[PDB]
mmCIF file with all atom_site columns, C-alpha atoms in Angstrom:
data_model
loop_
_atom_site.group_PDB
_atom_site.id
_atom_site.type_symbol
_atom_site.label_atom_id
_atom_site.label_alt_id
_atom_site.label_comp_id
_atom_site.label_asym_id
_atom_site.label_entity_id
_atom_site.label_seq_id
_atom_site.pdbx_PDB_ins_code
_atom_site.Cartn_x
_atom_site.Cartn_y
_atom_site.Cartn_z
_atom_site.occupancy
_atom_site.B_iso_or_equiv
_atom_site.pdbx_formal_charge
_atom_site.auth_seq_id
_atom_site.auth_comp_id
_atom_site.auth_asym_id
_atom_site.auth_atom_id
_atom_site.pdbx_PDB_model_num
ATOM 1   C CA . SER A 1 1  ? 54.289  115.174 239.961 1.00 37.50 ? 174 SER A CA 1
ATOM 2   C CA . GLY A 1 2  ? 57.196  114.083 241.841 1.00 36.13 ? 175 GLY A CA 1
ATOM 3   C CA . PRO A 1 3  ? 60.449  112.280 241.241 1.00 37.17 ? 176 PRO A CA 1
ATOM 4   C CA . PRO A 1 4  ? 60.864  108.553 240.506 1.00 34.08 ? 177 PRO A CA 1
ATOM 5   C CA . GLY A 1 5  ? 61.669  106.130 243.264 1.00 31.45 ? 178 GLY A CA 1
ATOM 6   C CA . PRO A 1 6  ? 65.200  104.565 244.478 1.00 27.03 ? 179 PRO A CA 1
ATOM 7   C CA . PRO A 1 7  ? 66.737  101.864 242.900 1.00 27.43 ? 180 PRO A CA 1
ATOM 8   C CA . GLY A 1 8  ? 65.229  98.604  244.432 1.00 28.31 ? 181 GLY A CA 1
ATOM 9   C CA . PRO A 1 9  ? 67.033  96.368  246.745 1.00 28.59 ? 182 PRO A CA 1
ATOM 10  C CA . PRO A 1 10 ? 69.765  94.040  245.753 1.00 28.70 ? 183 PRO A CA 1
ATOM 11  C CA . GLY A 1 11 ? 68.571  90.958  244.630 1.00 25.62 ? 184 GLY A CA 1
ATOM 12  C CA . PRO A 1 12 ? 68.839  87.520  246.567 1.00 24.09 ? 185 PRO A CA 1
ATOM 13  C CA . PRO A 1 13 ? 72.233  85.636  246.720 1.00 22.29 ? 186 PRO A CA 1
ATOM 14  C CA . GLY A 1 14 ? 73.136  83.327  243.616 1.00 22.84 ? 187 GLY A CA 1
ATOM 15  C CA . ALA A 1 15 ? 73.006  79.449  244.409 1.00 23.76 ? 188 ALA A CA 1
ATOM 16  C CA . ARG A 1 16 ? 75.810  77.696  245.876 1.00 21.89 ? 189 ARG A CA 1
ATOM 17  C CA . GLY A 1 17 ? 78.668  76.764  243.131 1.00 19.99 ? 190 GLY A CA 1
ATOM 18  C CA . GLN A 1 18 ? 78.930  73.122  242.048 1.00 22.74 ? 191 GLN A CA 1
ATOM 19  C CA . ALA A 1 19 ? 81.198  70.888  243.982 1.00 25.62 ? 192 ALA A CA 1
ATOM 20  C CA . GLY A 1 20 ? 85.035  70.975  242.986 1.00 24.34 ? 193 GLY A CA 1
ATOM 21  C CA . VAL A 1 21 ? 86.393  68.682  240.552 1.00 25.19 ? 194 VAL A CA 1
ATOM 22  C CA . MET A 1 22 ? 87.641  64.940  241.692 1.00 28.15 ? 195 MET A CA 1
ATOM 23  C CA . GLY A 1 23 ? 91.306  64.796  242.691 1.00 28.70 ? 196 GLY A CA 1
ATOM 24  C CA . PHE A 1 24 ? 94.171  63.211  241.164 1.00 25.76 ? 197 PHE A CA 1
ATOM 25  C CA . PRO A 1 25 ? 94.393  59.568  241.294 1.00 25.21 ? 198 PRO A CA 1
ATOM 26  C CA . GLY A 1 26 ? 96.702  57.928  243.770 1.00 27.32 ? 199 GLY A CA 1
ATOM 27  C CA . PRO A 1 27 ? 100.092 56.835  242.827 1.00 28.87 ? 200 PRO A CA 1
ATOM 28  C CA . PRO A 1 28 ? 101.001 52.944  241.987 1.00 29.83 ? 201 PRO A CA 1
ATOM 29  C CA . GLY A 1 29 ? 101.981 51.219  245.280 1.00 28.87 ? 202 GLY A CA 1
ATOM 30  C CA . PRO A 1 30 ? 105.678 50.584  246.062 1.00 29.13 ? 203 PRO A CA 1
ATOM 31  C CA . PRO A 1 31 ? 107.081 47.287  244.356 1.00 28.74 ? 204 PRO A CA 1
ATOM 32  C CA . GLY A 1 32 ? 106.773 44.111  246.400 1.00 28.40 ? 205 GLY A CA 1
ATOM 33  C CA . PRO A 1 33 ? 109.928 42.538  248.451 1.00 27.79 ? 206 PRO A CA 1
ATOM 34  C CA . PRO A 1 34 ? 112.231 40.636  246.697 1.00 26.93 ? 207 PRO A CA 1
ATOM 35  C CA . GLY A 1 35 ? 111.773 36.919  246.426 1.00 27.46 ? 208 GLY A CA 1
ATOM 36  C CA . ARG A 1 36 ? 113.817 34.604  248.704 1.00 31.62 ? 209 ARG A CA 1
ATOM 37  C CA . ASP A 1 37 ? 117.455 33.513  247.361 1.00 28.52 ? 210 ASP A CA 1
ATOM 38  C CA . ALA A 1 38 ? 118.122 29.864  246.630 1.00 25.72 ? 211 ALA A CA 1
ATOM 39  C CA . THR A 1 39 ? 119.791 28.447  249.539 1.00 25.45 ? 212 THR A CA 1
ATOM 40  C CA . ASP A 1 40 ? 122.701 26.382  249.684 1.00 26.13 ? 213 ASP A CA 1
ATOM 41  C CA . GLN A 1 41 ? 120.960 23.143  251.196 1.00 28.11 ? 214 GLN A CA 1
ATOM 42  C CA . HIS A 1 42 ? 120.060 21.775  247.505 1.00 27.91 ? 215 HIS A CA 1
ATOM 43  C CA . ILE A 1 43 ? 123.698 21.894  246.681 1.00 25.68 ? 216 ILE A CA 1
ATOM 44  C CA . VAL A 1 44 ? 124.695 20.446  250.121 1.00 25.54 ? 217 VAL A CA 1
ATOM 45  C CA . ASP A 1 45 ? 122.343 17.681  249.588 1.00 26.86 ? 218 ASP A CA 1
ATOM 46  C CA . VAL A 1 46 ? 123.675 16.767  246.056 1.00 24.46 ? 219 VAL A CA 1
ATOM 47  C CA . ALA A 1 47 ? 127.465 17.134  247.104 1.00 27.67 ? 220 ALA A CA 1
ATOM 48  C CA . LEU A 1 48 ? 126.794 14.679  249.997 1.00 28.05 ? 221 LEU A CA 1
ATOM 49  C CA . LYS A 1 49 ? 125.295 12.258  247.690 1.00 25.00 ? 222 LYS A CA 1
ATOM 50  C CA . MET A 1 50 ? 128.180 12.532  245.501 1.00 23.29 ? 223 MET A CA 1
ATOM 51  C CA . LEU A 1 51 ? 130.376 11.917  248.246 1.00 26.48 ? 224 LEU A CA 1
ATOM 52  C CA . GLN A 1 52 ? 128.910 8.722   249.266 1.00 25.90 ? 225 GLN A CA 1
ATOM 53  C CA . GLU A 1 53 ? 128.655 7.446   245.867 1.00 27.29 ? 226 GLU A CA 1
ATOM 54  C CA . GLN A 1 54 ? 132.312 7.903   245.199 1.00 26.58 ? 227 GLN A CA 1
ATOM 55  C CA . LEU A 1 55 ? 133.454 6.742   248.309 1.00 27.65 ? 228 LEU A CA 1
ATOM 56  C CA . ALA A 1 56 ? 131.538 3.686   247.899 1.00 25.31 ? 229 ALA A CA 1
ATOM 57  C CA . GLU A 1 57 ? 132.915 3.108   244.399 1.00 27.36 ? 230 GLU A CA 1
ATOM 58  C CA . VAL A 1 58 ? 136.397 3.136   246.030 1.00 25.34 ? 231 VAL A CA 1
ATOM 59  C CA . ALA A 1 59 ? 135.342 0.431   248.210 1.00 24.82 ? 232 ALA A CA 1
ATOM 60  C CA . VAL A 1 60 ? 134.286 -1.735  245.387 1.00 20.39 ? 233 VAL A CA 1
ATOM 61  C CA . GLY B 2 1  ? 55.384  113.134 245.595 1.00 19.06 ? 17  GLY B CA 1
ATOM 62  C CA . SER B 2 2  ? 58.350  110.837 245.682 1.00 16.37 ? 18  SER B CA 1
ATOM 63  C CA . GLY B 2 3  ? 58.380  107.390 244.217 1.00 17.52 ? 19  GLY B CA 1
ATOM 64  C CA . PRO B 2 4  ? 58.443  103.850 245.820 1.00 14.90 ? 20  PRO B CA 1
ATOM 65  C CA . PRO B 2 5  ? 61.728  102.019 245.612 1.00 18.20 ? 21  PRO B CA 1
ATOM 66  C CA . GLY B 2 6  ? 62.051  99.579  242.620 1.00 18.08 ? 22  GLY B CA 1
ATOM 67  C CA . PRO B 2 7  ? 61.427  95.707  242.828 1.00 18.15 ? 23  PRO B CA 1
ATOM 68  C CA . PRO B 2 8  ? 64.284  93.536  244.145 1.00 16.99 ? 24  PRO B CA 1
ATOM 69  C CA . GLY B 2 9  ? 67.046  92.980  241.769 1.00 19.06 ? 25  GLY B CA 1
ATOM 70  C CA . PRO B 2 10 ? 67.993  89.995  239.860 1.00 20.32 ? 26  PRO B CA 1
ATOM 71  C CA . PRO B 2 11 ? 69.309  86.968  241.676 1.00 18.47 ? 27  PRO B CA 1
ATOM 72  C CA . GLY B 2 12 ? 73.310  87.059  241.970 1.00 18.08 ? 28  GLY B CA 1
ATOM 73  C CA . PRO B 2 13 ? 75.556  84.938  240.065 1.00 20.03 ? 29  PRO B CA 1
ATOM 74  C CA . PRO B 2 14 ? 76.076  81.318  241.287 1.00 20.55 ? 30  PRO B CA 1
ATOM 75  C CA . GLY B 2 15 ? 79.093  80.729  243.585 1.00 22.13 ? 31  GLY B CA 1
ATOM 76  C CA . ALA B 2 16 ? 82.482  79.835  242.246 1.00 25.27 ? 32  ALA B CA 1
ATOM 77  C CA . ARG B 2 17 ? 83.147  76.045  241.920 1.00 28.64 ? 33  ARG B CA 1
ATOM 78  C CA . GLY B 2 18 ? 84.743  74.231  244.856 1.00 25.52 ? 34  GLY B CA 1
ATOM 79  C CA . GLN B 2 19 ? 88.332  73.438  245.152 1.00 25.13 ? 35  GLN B CA 1
ATOM 80  C CA . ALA B 2 20 ? 89.593  70.384  243.502 1.00 23.22 ? 36  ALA B CA 1
ATOM 81  C CA . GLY B 2 21 ? 89.686  67.122  245.596 1.00 24.60 ? 37  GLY B CA 1
ATOM 82  C CA . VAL B 2 22 ? 92.783  65.718  247.156 1.00 24.86 ? 38  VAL B CA 1
ATOM 83  C CA . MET B 2 23 ? 95.095  62.939  245.513 1.00 22.37 ? 39  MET B CA 1
ATOM 84  C CA . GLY B 2 24 ? 93.983  59.629  246.007 1.00 22.76 ? 40  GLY B CA 1
ATOM 85  C CA . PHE B 2 25 ? 95.659  57.120  248.331 1.00 22.19 ? 41  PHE B CA 1
ATOM 86  C CA . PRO B 2 26 ? 98.718  55.387  246.901 1.00 20.11 ? 42  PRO B CA 1
ATOM 87  C CA . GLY B 2 27 ? 98.169  51.711  245.778 1.00 21.29 ? 43  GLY B CA 1
ATOM 88  C CA . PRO B 2 28 ? 98.970  48.612  247.874 1.00 21.20 ? 44  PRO B CA 1
ATOM 89  C CA . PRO B 2 29 ? 102.659 47.253  247.708 1.00 20.27 ? 45  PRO B CA 1
ATOM 90  C CA . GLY B 2 30 ? 102.980 44.628  245.170 1.00 20.15 ? 46  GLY B CA 1
ATOM 91  C CA . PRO B 2 31 ? 103.201 40.923  245.356 1.00 18.47 ? 47  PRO B CA 1
ATOM 92  C CA . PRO B 2 32 ? 106.576 39.340  246.698 1.00 20.54 ? 48  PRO B CA 1
ATOM 93  C CA . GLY B 2 33 ? 109.145 38.444  243.902 1.00 20.08 ? 49  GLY B CA 1
ATOM 94  C CA . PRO B 2 34 ? 109.288 34.685  242.703 1.00 20.62 ? 50  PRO B CA 1
ATOM 95  C CA . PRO B 2 35 ? 111.949 32.708  244.676 1.00 22.53 ? 51  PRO B CA 1
ATOM 96  C CA . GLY B 2 36 ? 115.449 32.109  243.247 1.00 22.97 ? 52  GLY B CA 1
ATOM 97  C CA . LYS B 2 37 ? 115.458 28.984  241.140 1.00 22.94 ? 53  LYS B CA 1
ATOM 98  C CA . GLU B 2 38 ? 117.812 26.062  242.588 1.00 23.99 ? 54  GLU B CA 1
ATOM 99  C CA . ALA B 2 39 ? 120.326 24.619  240.520 1.00 25.81 ? 55  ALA B CA 1
ATOM 100 C CA . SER B 2 40 ? 119.579 21.174  239.084 1.00 27.12 ? 56  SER B CA 1
ATOM 101 C CA . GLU B 2 41 ? 121.283 17.801  240.298 1.00 31.78 ? 57  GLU B CA 1
ATOM 102 C CA . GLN B 2 42 ? 123.116 17.612  236.867 1.00 29.69 ? 58  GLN B CA 1
ATOM 103 C CA . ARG B 2 43 ? 124.442 21.114  236.940 1.00 32.21 ? 59  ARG B CA 1
ATOM 104 C CA . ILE B 2 44 ? 125.816 20.562  240.569 1.00 29.10 ? 60  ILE B CA 1
ATOM 105 C CA . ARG B 2 45 ? 127.297 17.110  239.515 1.00 28.92 ? 61  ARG B CA 1
ATOM 106 C CA . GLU B 2 46 ? 129.284 18.508  236.463 1.00 25.85 ? 62  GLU B CA 1
ATOM 107 C CA . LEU B 2 47 ? 130.634 21.612  238.502 1.00 25.53 ? 63  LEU B CA 1
ATOM 108 C CA . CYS B 2 48 ? 131.750 19.237  241.337 1.00 24.46 ? 64  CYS B CA 1
ATOM 109 C CA . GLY B 2 49 ? 132.354 16.005  239.928 1.00 25.57 ? 65  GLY B CA 1
ATOM 110 C CA . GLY B 2 50 ? 136.275 16.395  239.608 1.00 23.72 ? 66  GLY B CA 1
ATOM 111 C CA . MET B 2 51 ? 136.719 18.278  242.698 1.00 22.95 ? 67  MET B CA 1
ATOM 112 C CA . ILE B 2 52 ? 135.149 15.495  244.781 1.00 21.22 ? 68  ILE B CA 1
ATOM 113 C CA . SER B 2 53 ? 136.860 12.931  242.814 1.00 25.96 ? 69  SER B CA 1
ATOM 114 C CA . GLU B 2 54 ? 140.520 14.593  243.057 1.00 28.69 ? 70  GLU B CA 1
ATOM 115 C CA . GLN B 2 55 ? 140.091 15.424  246.922 1.00 29.78 ? 71  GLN B CA 1
ATOM 116 C CA . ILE B 2 56 ? 139.507 11.466  247.450 1.00 29.47 ? 72  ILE B CA 1
ATOM 117 C CA . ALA B 2 57 ? 142.163 10.246  245.216 1.00 26.51 ? 73  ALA B CA 1
ATOM 118 C CA . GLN B 2 58 ? 144.588 12.676  247.204 1.00 26.94 ? 74  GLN B CA 1
ATOM 119 C CA . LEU B 2 59 ? 143.225 11.497  250.468 1.00 28.73 ? 75  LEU B CA 1
ATOM 120 C CA . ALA B 2 60 ? 143.098 7.769   249.608 1.00 25.20 ? 76  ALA B CA 1
ATOM 121 C CA . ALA B 2 61 ? 146.908 7.956   248.476 1.00 27.05 ? 77  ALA B CA 1
ATOM 122 C CA . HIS B 2 62 ? 147.896 9.991   251.639 1.00 27.14 ? 78  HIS B CA 1
ATOM 123 C CA . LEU B 2 63 ? 146.363 7.212   253.984 1.00 28.98 ? 79  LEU B CA 1
ATOM 124 C CA . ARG B 2 64 ? 147.897 4.272   252.379 1.00 26.56 ? 80  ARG B CA 1
ATOM 125 C CA . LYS B 2 65 ? 151.121 5.857   251.896 1.00 24.25 ? 81  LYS B CA 1
ATOM 126 C CA . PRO B 2 66 ? 154.109 3.889   253.678 1.00 22.68 ? 82  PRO B CA 1
ATOM 127 C CA . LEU B 2 67 ? 156.708 5.789   255.478 1.00 17.36 ? 83  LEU B CA 1
ATOM 128 C CA . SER C 3 1  ? 52.587  110.318 242.656 1.00 16.63 ? 26  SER C CA 1
ATOM 129 C CA . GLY C 3 2  ? 56.018  109.766 241.711 1.00 15.72 ? 27  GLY C CA 1
ATOM 130 C CA . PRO C 3 3  ? 57.074  106.822 239.270 1.00 15.12 ? 28  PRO C CA 1
ATOM 131 C CA . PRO C 3 4  ? 58.467  103.542 240.811 1.00 12.48 ? 29  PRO C CA 1
ATOM 132 C CA . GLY C 3 5  ? 62.180  103.243 240.987 1.00 15.42 ? 30  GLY C CA 1
ATOM 133 C CA . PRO C 3 6  ? 64.285  101.203 238.761 1.00 16.28 ? 31  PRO C CA 1
ATOM 134 C CA . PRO C 3 7  ? 64.858  97.363  239.868 1.00 17.73 ? 32  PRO C CA 1
ATOM 135 C CA . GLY C 3 8  ? 67.709  97.040  242.253 1.00 18.13 ? 33  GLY C CA 1
ATOM 136 C CA . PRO C 3 9  ? 70.905  95.594  241.402 1.00 16.89 ? 34  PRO C CA 1
ATOM 137 C CA . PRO C 3 10 ? 72.047  92.111  240.780 1.00 18.67 ? 35  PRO C CA 1
ATOM 138 C CA . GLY C 3 11 ? 72.724  90.102  244.092 1.00 19.82 ? 36  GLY C CA 1
ATOM 139 C CA . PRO C 3 12 ? 75.738  88.573  246.093 1.00 20.98 ? 37  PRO C CA 1
ATOM 140 C CA . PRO C 3 13 ? 77.607  85.801  244.117 1.00 19.90 ? 38  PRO C CA 1
ATOM 141 C CA . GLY C 3 14 ? 76.632  82.317  246.099 1.00 18.83 ? 39  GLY C CA 1
ATOM 142 C CA . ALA C 3 15 ? 78.738  80.632  248.392 1.00 19.80 ? 40  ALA C CA 1
ATOM 143 C CA . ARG C 3 16 ? 81.848  78.640  246.808 1.00 20.38 ? 41  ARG C CA 1
ATOM 144 C CA . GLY C 3 17 ? 81.134  75.039  246.240 1.00 19.93 ? 42  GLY C CA 1
ATOM 145 C CA . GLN C 3 18 ? 82.189  72.473  248.698 1.00 21.13 ? 43  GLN C CA 1
ATOM 146 C CA . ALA C 3 19 ? 85.625  70.554  248.056 1.00 22.18 ? 44  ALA C CA 1
ATOM 147 C CA . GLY C 3 20 ? 85.696  68.008  245.221 1.00 20.23 ? 45  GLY C CA 1
ATOM 148 C CA . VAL C 3 21 ? 85.856  64.278  246.209 1.00 21.16 ? 46  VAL C CA 1
ATOM 149 C CA . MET C 3 22 ? 89.212  62.505  246.768 1.00 19.55 ? 47  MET C CA 1
ATOM 150 C CA . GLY C 3 23 ? 90.722  60.855  243.633 1.00 18.02 ? 48  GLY C CA 1
ATOM 151 C CA . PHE C 3 24 ? 90.758  57.187  242.856 1.00 17.25 ? 49  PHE C CA 1
ATOM 152 C CA . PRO C 3 25 ? 93.362  55.034  244.854 1.00 17.34 ? 50  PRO C CA 1
ATOM 153 C CA . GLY C 3 26 ? 96.681  53.955  243.180 1.00 14.70 ? 51  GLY C CA 1
ATOM 154 C CA . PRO C 3 27 ? 97.013  50.571  241.443 1.00 14.17 ? 52  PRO C CA 1
ATOM 155 C CA . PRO C 3 28 ? 99.162  47.903  243.224 1.00 12.82 ? 53  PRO C CA 1
ATOM 156 C CA . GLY C 3 29 ? 102.891 48.132  242.974 1.00 12.41 ? 54  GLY C CA 1
ATOM 157 C CA . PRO C 3 30 ? 104.690 45.884  240.590 1.00 10.40 ? 55  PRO C CA 1
ATOM 158 C CA . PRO C 3 31 ? 105.993 42.452  241.891 1.00 8.82  ? 56  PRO C CA 1
ATOM 159 C CA . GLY C 3 32 ? 109.463 42.611  243.436 1.00 6.06  ? 57  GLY C CA 1
ATOM 160 C CA . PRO C 3 33 ? 112.625 41.278  241.894 1.00 4.44  ? 58  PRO C CA 1
ATOM 161 C CA . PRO C 3 34 ? 113.152 37.624  241.683 1.00 2.00  ? 59  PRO C CA 1
ATOM 162 C CA . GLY C 3 35 ? 115.509 35.935  244.221 1.00 2.00  ? 60  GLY C CA 1
ATOM 163 C CA . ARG C 3 36 ? 119.066 35.187  243.160 1.00 2.00  ? 61  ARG C CA 1
ATOM 164 C CA . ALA C 3 37 ? 120.003 31.735  241.945 1.00 2.00  ? 62  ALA C CA 1
ATOM 165 C CA . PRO C 3 38 ? 123.572 30.283  242.855 1.00 2.00  ? 63  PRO C CA 1
ATOM 166 C CA . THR C 3 39 ? 126.419 30.888  240.278 1.00 2.00  ? 64  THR C CA 1
ATOM 167 C CA . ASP C 3 40 ? 128.571 28.143  239.083 1.00 3.40  ? 65  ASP C CA 1
ATOM 168 C CA . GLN C 3 41 ? 131.515 29.603  241.219 1.00 2.70  ? 66  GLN C CA 1
ATOM 169 C CA . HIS C 3 42 ? 129.042 29.510  244.292 1.00 2.00  ? 67  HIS C CA 1
ATOM 170 C CA . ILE C 3 43 ? 128.185 26.156  243.914 1.00 2.00  ? 68  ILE C CA 1
ATOM 171 C CA . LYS C 3 44 ? 132.102 25.160  243.449 1.00 2.00  ? 69  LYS C CA 1
ATOM 172 C CA . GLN C 3 45 ? 132.621 26.952  246.833 1.00 2.00  ? 70  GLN C CA 1
ATOM 173 C CA . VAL C 3 46 ? 129.650 25.173  248.615 1.00 2.00  ? 71  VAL C CA 1
ATOM 174 C CA . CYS C 3 47 ? 130.922 21.811  247.355 1.00 2.00  ? 72  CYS C CA 1
ATOM 175 C CA . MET C 3 48 ? 134.510 22.422  248.637 1.00 2.74  ? 73  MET C CA 1
ATOM 176 C CA . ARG C 3 49 ? 133.259 23.557  252.078 1.00 3.25  ? 74  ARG C CA 1
ATOM 177 C CA . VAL C 3 50 ? 131.181 20.186  252.236 1.00 2.00  ? 75  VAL C CA 1
ATOM 178 C CA . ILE C 3 51 ? 134.249 18.288  251.505 1.00 2.00  ? 76  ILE C CA 1
ATOM 179 C CA . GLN C 3 52 ? 136.025 20.063  254.051 1.00 2.00  ? 77  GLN C CA 1
ATOM 180 C CA . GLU C 3 53 ? 133.283 19.791  256.810 1.00 2.00  ? 78  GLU C CA 1
ATOM 181 C CA . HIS C 3 54 ? 133.104 16.070  255.990 1.00 2.00  ? 79  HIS C CA 1
ATOM 182 C CA . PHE C 3 55 ? 136.688 15.247  255.408 1.00 2.00  ? 80  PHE C CA 1
ATOM 183 C CA . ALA C 3 56 ? 136.560 13.285  258.785 1.00 2.00  ? 81  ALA C CA 1
ATOM 184 C CA . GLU C 3 57 ? 133.965 10.890  257.218 1.00 2.00  ? 82  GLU C CA 1
ATOM 185 C CA . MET C 3 58 ? 136.048 10.477  254.035 1.00 2.00  ? 83  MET C CA 1
ATOM 186 C CA . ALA C 3 59 ? 139.006 9.692   255.914 1.00 2.38  ? 84  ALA C CA 1
ATOM 187 C CA . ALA C 3 60 ? 137.166 7.006   258.060 1.00 5.18  ? 85  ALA C CA 1
ATOM 188 C CA . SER C 3 61 ? 135.881 5.486   255.081 1.00 7.15  ? 86  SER C CA 1
ATOM 189 C CA . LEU C 3 62 ? 139.507 5.100   253.756 1.00 4.00  ? 87  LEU C CA 1
ATOM 190 C CA . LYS C 3 63 ? 141.589 4.272   256.943 1.00 6.63  ? 88  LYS C CA 1
ATOM 191 C CA . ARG C 3 64 ? 140.774 3.218   260.421 1.00 8.02  ? 89  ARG C CA 1
ATOM 192 C CA . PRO C 3 65 ? 142.737 1.791   263.325 1.00 6.85  ? 90  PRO C CA 1
ATOM 193 C CA . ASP C 3 66 ? 144.216 -1.595  262.478 1.00 6.03  ? 91  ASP C CA 1
#
């Protein structure tokens, strides 16, 4: 004859949420170092060659 | 008299999605730049031909001068 | 003798997902700038230095004792 029962116990907790989204791609690396500057040696070698050539041409 | 408590409720909602991942590592440094091009012999000869010739001529005249 | 109760309330939300995986590594950097080539003026300056540095050899080739 009596009153209906209580609402039941709260349900079980839900499953774990899906893992987070992948992070942003890393930035491009820094630019490489500057190439070696051309040294003066290749100019010195030729200048010395010309000096010898022209000095010898005065000898003749 | 008074009723049994109802059956257990429905399962809860799935948890919130995880936080976004951390940014990836920066790339490696680029390759070194190409070496500076050397001047050709012809280019050097053209630029220094008259200079060397004038210097030799001036010196030759100076050393074979009479007082 | 009383009716059974209504079904309980919806349960807890689940625990939050684990953090996402780190992103892709970045691409390699660009190649460096080229080395510098000599200018016409620089070439002339070097040539004049060589003449000065070997002026002794030049004089000797043109004039010696006796």
